[PDB]
Amino acid sequence: ITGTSTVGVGRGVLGDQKNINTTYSTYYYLQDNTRGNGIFTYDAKYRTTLPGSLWADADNQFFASYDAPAVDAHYYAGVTYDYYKNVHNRLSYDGNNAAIRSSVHYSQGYNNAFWNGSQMVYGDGDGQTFIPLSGGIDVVAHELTHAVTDYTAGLIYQNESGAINEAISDIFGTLVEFYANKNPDWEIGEDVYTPGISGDSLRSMSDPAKYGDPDHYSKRYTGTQDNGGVHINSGIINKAAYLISQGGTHYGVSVVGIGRDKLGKIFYRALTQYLTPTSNFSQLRAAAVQSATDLYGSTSQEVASVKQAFDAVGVK
């Protein structure tokens, strides 16, 4: 809507206070006009109809329990937009400042979050397995990254291409978590997963096997479940990304870490310049090697580490 840009205050899912960009026109709306064509957050009101109604508030103060998921979805979408703009010089997900839209309070006791091809959607969780999903910065960044992938490589959400699609979202979800410096780690969804259990997460990039996901190509899932194991086989790529950044010895293969910044640069270039809709793991290796070569030279330590990392996880 058309109005005056202002700043409100509220509390997120984890009880932390933060300032959020809003728009005033009779009501205060969760509409951030400071980033691209805007960031809009909607209330799905426990229904499945999308996007719902643009979030309206009477006093620009969002401290109600019902407001929490909206506060975080709105705020973290902003942080993710900043990451892509400041670190990769990318304006929004389409590269042309497309408006970012998110709907919270989707359905009842819904344990997932997703990008539906047009916007992000967040469930509130069942209170046991998950609390409102927008409370996790890595979750929000994971979802917005699916939008970036859709407008670039266009990786099909099935089999190996789908596993890469998923890994890319976990990789950048984690890099954004480090960017925001919010208790960063190489785990996925730890802030909103199982509130009754501390120290766990949905997936682990440092050690995928911790939760039963493969950490080597020889252990890849070849079934039909989960669209060919897109959330399972992503562990093979996540482990490779972790090794490239942090280094380590995996299955007898030693990798010298080159850091998170370079990891981000290499994968962003691979995603936007070399990957295609049907790229498989072997092609991802080639794309990553070529990207590192473009940026640091064929005889660089960076290229060597990328090769070692993929060798470690058995991707030739």
Catalytically annotated residues: 143, 231
Q: Are 135 and 256 in contact (CB under 8 A)?
A: no
- Check residue 149 for interaction with Zn ion (CB under 5 A): no
Query: Which one of residues 16, 185, 207, 294 is an interface residue with Ca ion (CB under 5 A)?
Result: 185
Closest CA to 50 of 100, 114, 119, 96: 119
> Total number of residues binding Zn ion (CB under 5 A)?
1
Query: Which one of residues 72, 124, 138, 215 is an interface residue with Ca ion (CB under 5 A)?
Result: 138
Q: Select the binding partner of residue 185 from Zn ion, Ca ion, none (C-beta < 5 to 8 A, by kind).
A: Ca ion
List the interface residues with Zn ion, window 158-177 (CB under 5 A).
Answer: 169
Closest CA to 135 of 155, 113, 118, 150: 113
Sign, Cα dihedral of 144, 79, 26, 58:
positive
- Check residue 183 for interaction with Ca ion (CB under 5 A): yes
Q: Select the binding partner of residue 61 from Zn ion, Ca ion, none (C-beta < 5 to 8 A, by kind).
A: Ca ion
- Check residue 22 for interaction with Zn ion (CB under 5 A): no
- For strands 100-106 and 120-123, give the pairing: parallel
| Contact characters 194-223, Ca ion, x per CB under 5 A | x--x--x-----------------------
DSSP single-letter state for residue 218:
G
CB of 268 to Zn ion, least distance (A): 17
| Contact characters 54-73, Ca ion, x per CB under 5 A | ---x-x-x------------
| Cα distance between residue 284 and residue 275, in whole Å | 7
Closest CA to 237 of 273, 274, 282, 272: 282
Annotation: binding site:
57, 59, 61, 138, 142, 146, 166, 177, 183, 185, 187, 190, 193-194, 197, 200
The shares of helix, strand and coil residues in the chain, as percent rounded to the nearest 5, are 40, 20, 40
For Zn ion, the closer of residues 44 and 155 by Cβ is 155
Q: Select the binding partner of residue 199 from Zn ion, Ca ion, none (C-beta < 5 to 8 A, by kind).
A: none
- Secondary element (H or E) of residue 172: helix 159-180
Q: Select the binding partner of residue 222 from Zn ion, Ca ion, none (C-beta < 5 to 8 A, by kind).
A: none
Which amino acid is present at 163? A
- Check residue 129 for interaction with Ca ion (CB under 5 A): no
| Cα distance between residue 240 and residue 314, in whole Å | 10
CB of 55 to Ca ion, least distance (A): 10
Q: Cα–Cα distances in Å, from 58 out to 23, 119, 147, 239?
A: 12, 25, 32, 47
Q: Which residues bind Ca ion (CB under 5 A)?
A: 57, 59, 61, 138, 177, 183, 185, 187, 193-194, 197, 200
Q: Which residues bind Zn ion (CB under 5 A)?
A: 169
